Amino acid sequence: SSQIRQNYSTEVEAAVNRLVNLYLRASYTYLSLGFYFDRDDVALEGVCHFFRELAEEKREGAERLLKMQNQRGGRALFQDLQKPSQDEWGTTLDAMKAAIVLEKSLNQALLDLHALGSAQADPHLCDFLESHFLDEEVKLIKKMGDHLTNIQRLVGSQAGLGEYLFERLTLKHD
Amino acid sequence: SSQIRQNYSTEVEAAVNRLVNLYLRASYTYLSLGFYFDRDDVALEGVCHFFRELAEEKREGAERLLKMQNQRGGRALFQDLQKPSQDEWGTTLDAMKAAIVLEKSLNQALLDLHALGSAQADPHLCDFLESHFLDEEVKLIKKMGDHLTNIQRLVGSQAGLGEYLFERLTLKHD
Amino acid sequence: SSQIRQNYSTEVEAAVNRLVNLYLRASYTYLSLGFYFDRDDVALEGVCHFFRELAEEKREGAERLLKMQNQRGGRALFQDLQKPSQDEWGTTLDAMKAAIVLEKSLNQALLDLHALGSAQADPHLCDFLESHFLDEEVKLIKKMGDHLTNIQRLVGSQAGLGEYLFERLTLKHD
Amino acid sequence: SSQIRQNYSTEVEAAVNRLVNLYLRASYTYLSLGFYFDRDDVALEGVCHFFRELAEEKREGAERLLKMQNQRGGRALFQDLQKPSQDEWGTTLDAMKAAIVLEKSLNQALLDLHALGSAQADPHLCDFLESHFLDEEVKLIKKMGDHLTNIQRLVGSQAGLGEYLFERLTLKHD
Amino acid sequence: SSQIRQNYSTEVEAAVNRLVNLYLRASYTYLSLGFYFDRDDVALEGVCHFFRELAEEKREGAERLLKMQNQRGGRALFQDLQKPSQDEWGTTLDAMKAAIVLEKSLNQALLDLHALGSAQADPHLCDFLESHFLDEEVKLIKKMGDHLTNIQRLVGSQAGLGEYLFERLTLKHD
Amino acid sequence: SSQIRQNYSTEVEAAVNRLVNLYLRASYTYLSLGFYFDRDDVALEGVCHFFRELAEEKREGAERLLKMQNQRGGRALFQDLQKPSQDEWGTTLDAMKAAIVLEKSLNQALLDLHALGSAQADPHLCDFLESHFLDEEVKLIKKMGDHLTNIQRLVGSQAGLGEYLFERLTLKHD
Ligand SMILES: C=CC1=C(C)c2cc3[nH]c(cc4nc(cc5[nH]c(cc1n2)c(C)c5C=C)C(C)=C4CCC(=O)O)c(CCC(=O)O)c3C
Ligand SMILES: C=CC1=C(C)c2cc3[nH]c(cc4nc(cc5[nH]c(cc1n2)c(C)c5C=C)C(C)=C4CCC(=O)O)c(CCC(=O)O)c3C
Ligand SMILES: C=CC1=C(C)c2cc3[nH]c(cc4nc(cc5[nH]c(cc1n2)c(C)c5C=C)C(C)=C4CCC(=O)O)c(CCC(=O)O)c3C
């Protein structure tokens, strides 16, 4: 019995350790996506950059859960990281559609972990979770939605030009 | 046939893609190691820091291979990342002994990829590899060896004090 | 027998003097290309600029081989410079397609000279060559490939607009 | 019929395109001369420098004619560049004697093109030519003459010492 | 078996330890040469300075081999340093002729050690060697050759004046 | 008879030339010592640094005797430099014990040369010697003695820890 731990349920840490593997594996899809747009036959650098910073952000979410878990008297247990679920990612459109989903998946996770953190009454969890995680997750998921409208409204006329303009003026304007 | 690729063998990229998975999985052991020393019952922060920067360095080596591979006309293929090969890591001594090895393993890899890069005559590979990889690898592997002498010469008297002094004055002196 | 020369084969310099004429004549195509886009009936200034700096870069590669050759005890022998192999260069697309090739041609040259520099064992050559030449050549040949994807994805819808946007936002964004 | 061209005779551009090839080929002799004094058995660096900047100046004259020609509605046509007319260049004296001549040759050209530009009444030509070209050409041809007096007055006593002093104190005094 | 060493052949270090003694003994000739021109009956300070900095440069090459050798798991073994092979060094001409040779001798050494470093397949050696050693060695050996042309072209008229001018204006002009 | 020399005995210079070889060979032991503590199985960097600066200091003493000797009308004659008298140097304790001695040996030399410089009446010698040499020699020999007390008082309990603390806090405190 680690002289620190208090109010930390064993399921609350089992959930934190799956969260850790979720962030690490979403971080994996993001670099998988990134180098796919650096490819010389896709050549869409604005997009690589979008995804390479996302990958970082996710590794950050991971490191932060690891740190809070050690701070509560948890035992960070690691599992292996499932490889990305597709290799060629298509259009920006399609890449972006895979993305907004990986993000409903992780927000959903936060949502379920936050709940177990309350029905199994857990005060500073039902705050550590929302302040960094729940919140950024909503901002990120709106801005991902706005991107889709935009690339859809563009890439639906003559599509190749839509992709270009979008990466040239969206990641170089706002 | 990607209009870019020239002098890049298919085995040279298969090797680069295993190198990518080697760097990613060594990056995995390093964060596994790091959070283990942030544990409140190990409490050796100097060591967490050592390993958390190493983990980064390795993710860097990875990103750099991914980037050169896309630059040669390669197809970065990803595999899943094997989980760390141990969970509790012991003493700094033992953690450090696991480390100098993960590093002979990756240097050995560089060594074999560099060789296939020449017996299958490959000019800017038999330079991209040494300038970042081969070289840092030697500096890193000496400094890891010097650490062992030091922690061995300390942690062999009354061991607990050796661990402390070493993390307090080595990661806070040189 | 020039009191300097050491380990420098006569074929290694014959190759360096063809390399010199290759760089000088690729430098020639680049200015030929450049003034063609300054033409008032092509009017695509972003492109002239692309090619006028390339022409310089190549004259640089040339001067540098001349200098290393005098540094090894070689006798720089000059030949005349073959005029560009086409006069009107078309579309940016077509101009760009002529380009990525002049560049596989010179990289191939570096590749063959580097090899003769080793099968005829030649240590500081099998380094002078890669550090400036082999390496820049790969970076240049990727970025030329990325350009093609981009102008192809644009100039394939209504083509005239593709050309315009590409020169306006690519050479004025990244 | 290019919607720009006005008062530009076809012979005025044929002359401008030979002028272009004259500047390019004089630029060729100058680098041929330059690397000859970087040779370790001539070793006269002050002189290499003299000629390497001259070579640039000439490439400049060339680029400028190309640019004015595109500005008048001309079609810049390129020809190949005749290799330098000698390989070993001797003494500074002799190198310098080859030089003052390549310069009467190009000034003579300016002189004949300027004339056709008037007997075939051509107003902004019979100014573009003198402002950059005719004028610099006189200053350059005096200073080349002054150099000859000087190296002749020196290199006529015990000659080797004359060469040395001249390159040491002339290109390092005025 | 030193826990560090990897891919380092025993002959590769035996060669590195002779290299160490070569650099140390060339460093010895250079100070032997230096104080000979500080002599009040030679009095040629520009030359002492030339050689005293060369001596340093060589001690540097030595220290650097010692450091890389300890970095590979080698055992730096020292031998005694053979005294300079002449005591009075003559003219600058003669001093300089002894020099360009001590330098073909060490470049030749680099050349042979680099080769054993490859026929006995050794990746980060066949780079540590060229980046500092092989390369500087060529630049140094050209500039030494240029000096000879110069002092020969001077010291061949009335010789005493040639020596003076050369040390006064070469080591005080470029 | 060198027109400079005055009051300089031939034995005074024979002594200065042995002094030169003493400084050069003590400079040799110091680098021999230095790289021994850079070894990855000794790993005591504070000590390498101690000895590498000592080695320099000694080369300085040497260069200074060479310079005064040329200043008096002496003929600096060189001899070869005897290799260090031991290869593995042990403990800091033992390394340090070899050191304080190489220093009584050179101070003793200064002492005997200073004496011959007076019984063979020699005014500016019986000052050049004490101002740089005799004096620094006493300061150096006290501080070497203080080090011994300290490492002895430490390395006599559990010895490995004594070595560590001493190099960590002595070369990083005062
Ligand atoms: C293969 C799946 C993974 C992906 C795609 C991934 C992606 C990243 N990991 C990063 C940083 C990092 N990743 C890190 C440990 C790991 N990262 C790992 C796996 C992944 N990490 C593994 C395995 C690790 C252990 C679990 C660490 C420690 C950092 C650096 C943190 C720091 O200190 O800056 C960055 C930041 C790059 C930059 O320069 O902006 C990315 C994009
Ligand atoms: C072989 C005959 C040639 C010689 C000797 C020559 C010499 C030169 N060309 C230069 C620059 C240049 N030369 C250039 C295009 C060419 N240059 C070429 C042929 C020659 N160019 C060819 C062939 C080209 C096309 C006609 C360009 C574009 C520049 C650079 C202009 C700029 O943008 O700075 C420079 C400037 C070097 C410096 O660093 O100061 C020299 C000396
Ligand atoms: C093998 C025995 C020797 C040892 C161990 C030695 C050690 C040294 N010699 C140095 C500098 C130097 N050593 C020098 C000439 C010699 N040095 C030589 C032999 C030795 N020199 C020989 C042989 C030389 C001629 C007698 C010179 C000229 C310098 C540099 C002086 C300057 O101009 O800075 C330095 C300074 C290193 C630094 O970066 O702080 C050390 C440690």
HEC-encoded secondary structure of C107-172: HHHHHHHHHHHHHCCCCCHHHHHHHHHHHHHHHHHHHHHHHHHHHHHHCCCCHHHHHHHHHHHHHH
Atom of ligand 3 at shortest range from CA of E52: 28
Question: What is the CA(B56)–ligand 1 centre distance, in A?
Answer: 6
**Kind plus residue range of the DSSP H or E element containing D23:** helix D10-37
β partners of residue D81:
C81
Give exposure, E95-128, as e/b (b: 16+ Cβ within 10 Å): bbbbbbebbbebbebbbebbebbbeeebbbbbbb
Ligand 1 pocket member B56 (CB < 6 A): yes
Chains E and A touching, counted as 3 or more CB pairs less than 8 Å apart: no
Partner residue opposite A2 with nearest CB, options B38, B41, B78:
B41
- The verdict on a CB contact (< 8 Å) between A158 and C158 is yes
Rounded to an integer, what distance in angstroms lies between the CA atom of residue C133 and that of residue B126?
A: 14
Out of D51, D59, D65, give the residue to mutate to test ligand 2, the one with the largest number of ligand atoms within 8 Å of its CB. D59
Rounded to an integer, what distance in angstroms lies between the CA atom of residue F48 and that of residue F158?
A: 23
Locate tokens 């998946």: which residue? Answer: A105
All residues of chain C having their beta carbon less than 8 Å from the beta carbon of residue B70 are: 142
Q: 3-state DSSP call for residue B173?
A: coil
The token duo for E13 is: 């270090």
Locate tokens 């490995």: which residue? Answer: F160
Would you say B80 and A81 are in contact if contact means Cβ atoms under 8 Å apart? yes
The token duo for A60 is: 């950050």
Give the chain A residue nearest B77 (alpha carbons): A87
All residues of chain E having their beta carbon less than 8 Å from the beta carbon of residue F79 are: 83
Three-state secondary structure readout of E70-130? HHCCCCCCCCCECCCCCCCCCCHHHHHHHHHHHHHHHHHHHHHHHHHHHHCCCCCHHHHHH
The alpha carbon of residue A157 is apart from the nearest alpha carbon of chain C, in Å, by 10
Rounded to an integer, what distance in angstroms lies between the CA atom of residue D163 and that of residue D167?
A: 6
DSSP secondary structure of chain F: --TT--S--HHHHHHHHHHHHHHHHHHHHHHHHHHHHTSTTT--HHHHHHHHHHHHHHHHHHHHHHHHHHHTT-------BPPPS-S---SHHHHHHHHHHHHHHHHHHHHHHHHHHHHTT-TTHHHHIIIIIIHHHHHHHHHHHHHHHHHHHHTTSSHHHHHHHHHHHGGGT-
Sorted by sequence, the CB contacts under 8 Å of residue B10 that are 6+ apart come out as none
- The verdict on a CB contact (< 8 Å) between C142 and A168 is no
What is the Cα gyration radius of chain B? 18
Would you say D70 and C33 are in contact if contact means Cβ atoms under 8 Å apart? no
* CA–CA distances in Å: residue B95 to residues B36, C86, C94, C133: 10, 65, 59, 43
Q: At what angle do helices A45-71 and B10-37 cross, to 10 degrees?
A: 30
Locate tokens 């950024």: which residue? Answer: A136
- The verdict on a CB contact (< 8 Å) between E154 and D172 is no
β partners of residue A81:
B81
**Neighbouring subunits of D (3+ Cβ pairs under 8 A):** C, E
Determine whether E164 is exposed, middle or buried from the number of CB atoms within 10 Å of its CB (0-12, 13-18, 19+). middle
Report which protein residue has its CA nearest ligand 2's atom 12: C56
Which one of E116, E126, E138 would you mutate to disrupt binding with C, by most C Cβ within 10 Å of its Cβ? E138
* CA–CA distances in Å: residue C27 to residues C54, C139, F162: 7, 18, 67
DSSP secondary structure of chain A: --TT--S--HHHHHHHHHHHHHHHHHHHHHHHHHHHHTSTTT--HHHHHHHHHHHHHHHHHHHHHHHHHHHTT-------BPPPS-S---SHHHHHHHHHHHHHHHHHHHHHHHHHHHHTT-TTHHHHIIIIIIHHHHHHHHHHHHHHHHHHHHTTSSHHHHHHHHHHHGGGT-
Partner residue opposite E40 with nearest CB, options F2, F81, F87:
F2
**Neighbouring subunits of E (3+ Cβ pairs under 8 A):** B, C, D, F
Q: 3-state DSSP call for residue B40?
A: coil
Rounded to an integer, what distance in angstroms lies between the CA atom of residue A147 and that of residue A158?
A: 18
Out of C59, C65, C67, C106, give the residue to mutate to test ligand 2, the one with the largest number of ligand atoms within 8 Å of its CB. C59
Q: 3-state DSSP call for residue B5?
A: coil
Partner residue opposite D83 with nearest CB, options C66, C78, C87:
C78
What are residue F81's phi and psi, to 5 degrees? -95, 110
Would you say C103 and C137 are in contact if contact means Cβ atoms under 8 Å apart? yes
Locate tokens 């004028």: which residue? Answer: D135
Rounded to an integer, what distance in angstroms lies between the CA atom of residue E109 and that of residue E28?
A: 17
The alpha carbon of residue C163 is apart from the nearest alpha carbon of chain D, in Å, by 21
Chains D and F touching, counted as 3 or more CB pairs less than 8 Å apart: no
Sorted by sequence, the CB contacts under 8 Å of residue A156 that are 6+ apart come out as A162
Of the candidates C36, C32, C34, C39, the one whose C-alpha atom is nearest the C-alpha of residue C53 is C34
Considering Cα of F101, then F102, then F107, then F111, what sign does the dihedral take? positive
Rounded to an integer, what distance in angstroms lies between the CA atom of residue E56 and that of residue E134?
A: 18
β partners of residue B81:
A81
Would you say C33 and C99 are in contact if contact means Cβ atoms under 8 Å apart? yes
Of the candidates B73, B60, B3, B67, the one whose C-alpha atom is nearest the C-alpha of residue B26 is B60
Give the residue numbers spanning the domain of E149: 1-174
Sorted by sequence, the CB contacts under 8 Å of residue E9 that are 6+ apart come out as E116, E120, E122
Would you say A22 and A106 are in contact if contact means Cβ atoms under 8 Å apart? yes
Rounded to an integer, what distance in angstroms lies between the CA atom of residue F8 and that of residue F123?
A: 10
Rounded to an integer, what distance in angstroms lies between the CA atom of residue E170 and that of residue D124?
A: 50
Q: At what angle do helices B92-119 and B159-169 cross, to 10 degrees?
A: 60
Rounded to an integer, what distance in angstroms lies between the CA atom of residue B154 and that of residue B163?
A: 7
Residue C82 C-beta-side C-alpha neighbours within 13 Å: 8
The alpha carbon of residue C79 is apart from the nearest alpha carbon of chain D, in Å, by 5
What are residue D158's phi and psi, to 5 degrees? -90, 110
Would you say A148 and A95 are in contact if contact means Cβ atoms under 8 Å apart? no
In sequence order, which ranges of D38-134 are alpha helices (DSSP H)? 45-71, 92-119, 125-128
Residue B72 sits at the vertex; the CA angle it makes with B68 and B75, to the nearest 5 degrees, is 85
- How long, in residues, is chain D? 174
Of the candidates E29, E4, E21, the one whose C-alpha atom is nearest the C-alpha of residue E98 is E29
Out of A38, A59, A89, give the residue to mutate to test ligand 1, the one with the largest number of ligand atoms within 8 Å of its CB. A59
Partner residue opposite C145 with nearest CB, options B3, B7, B124:
B3
Q: Which CATH number do you get for residue A126?
A: 1.20.1260.10
Locate tokens 């949502």: which residue? Answer: A111
F57 in a known ligand binding site: yes
- How long, in residues, is chain C? 174
- As for ligand 3, residues whose beta carbon falls within 6 Å of it are E 24, 27-28, 31, 52, 55-56, 59, 81; F 24, 27-28, 31, 52, 55-56, 59, 81
**Number of separate domains in chain E:** 1
Query: What does the DSSP 8-state code read for residue B82?
Result: P
Binding residues of E for Fe cation: 53, 56-57, 60, 63
Question: What is the CA(F56)–ligand 3 centre distance, in A?
Answer: 6
Partner residue opposite C134 with nearest CB, options B3, B70, B124:
B124
- The verdict on a CB contact (< 8 Å) between B114 and E127 is no
Question: What is the CA(D21)–ligand 2 centre distance, in A?
Answer: 13
Which ligand has the minimum distance to the alpha carbon of residue A20?
A: 1
Ligand 2 pocket member D97 (CB < 6 A): no
Locate tokens 């996710």: which residue? Answer: A58
What amino acid occupies position A125? L
- The verdict on a CB contact (< 8 Å) between A43 and C149 is yes
β partners of residue F81:
E81
Partner residue opposite C35 with nearest CB, options D38, D70, D87:
D70
Q: 3-state DSSP call for residue E49?
A: helix
F56 in a known ligand binding site: yes
Question: What is the CA(A164)–ligand 1 centre distance, in A?
Answer: 29
Residue A72 Cα to chain centre, angstroms:
24
Would you say C27 and C102 are in contact if contact means Cβ atoms under 8 Å apart? no
Rounded to an integer, what distance in angstroms lies between the CA atom of residue B130 and that of residue E125?
A: 10
Ligand 2 pocket member C112 (CB < 6 A): no
Report which protein residue has its CA nearest ligand 3's atom 25: E28
Sorted by sequence, the CB contacts under 8 Å of residue C17 that are 6+ apart come out as C69, C74, C76, C77, C78, C79
Rounded to an integer, what distance in angstroms lies between the CA atom of residue B151 and that of residue B163?
A: 7
Q: What is the resolution of this structure in A?
A: 2.6
In sequence order, which ranges of chain B are alpha helices (DSSP H)? 10-37, 45-71, 92-119, 125-128, 135-154, 159-169
Determine whether C39 is exposed, middle or buried from the number of CB atoms within 10 Å of its CB (0-12, 13-18, 19+). buried
- What dihedral angle (degrees, nearest 10) is formed by the CA atoms of B16, B20, B21, B26? 130
Rounded to an integer, what distance in angstroms lies between the CA atom of residue E26 and that of residue E32?
A: 10
For B138-142, the CB contacts below 8 A with 24+ separation are B138/B107, B138/E71, B138/E72, B138/E124, B139/E71, B140/B103, B141/B100, B141/B103, B141/B104, B141/B107, B141/E4, B141/E6, B142/E4, B142/E70, B142/E71, B142/F40
Rounded to an integer, what distance in angstroms lies between the CA atom of residue B63 and that of residue F8?
A: 70
Rounded to an integer, what distance in angstroms lies between the CA atom of residue C114 and that of residue C112?
A: 5
Binding residues of D for Fe cation: 53, 56-57, 60, 63
Which ligand has the minimum distance to the alpha carbon of residue A26?
A: 1
All residues of chain B having their beta carbon less than 8 Å from the beta carbon of residue A3 are: 40
Rounded to an integer, what distance in angstroms lies between the CA atom of residue F37 and that of residue F51?
A: 9
- The verdict on a CB contact (< 8 Å) between F35 and E73 is no
Residue B82 Cα to chain centre, angstroms:
15
Rounded to an integer, what distance in angstroms lies between the CA atom of residue D19 and that of residue A99?
A: 60
Residue D53 Cα to chain centre, angstroms:
11
Ligand 1 pocket member A28 (CB < 6 A): yes
Q: How many residue pairs bridge chain B and chain F with CB atoms within 8 Å of each other?
A: 38
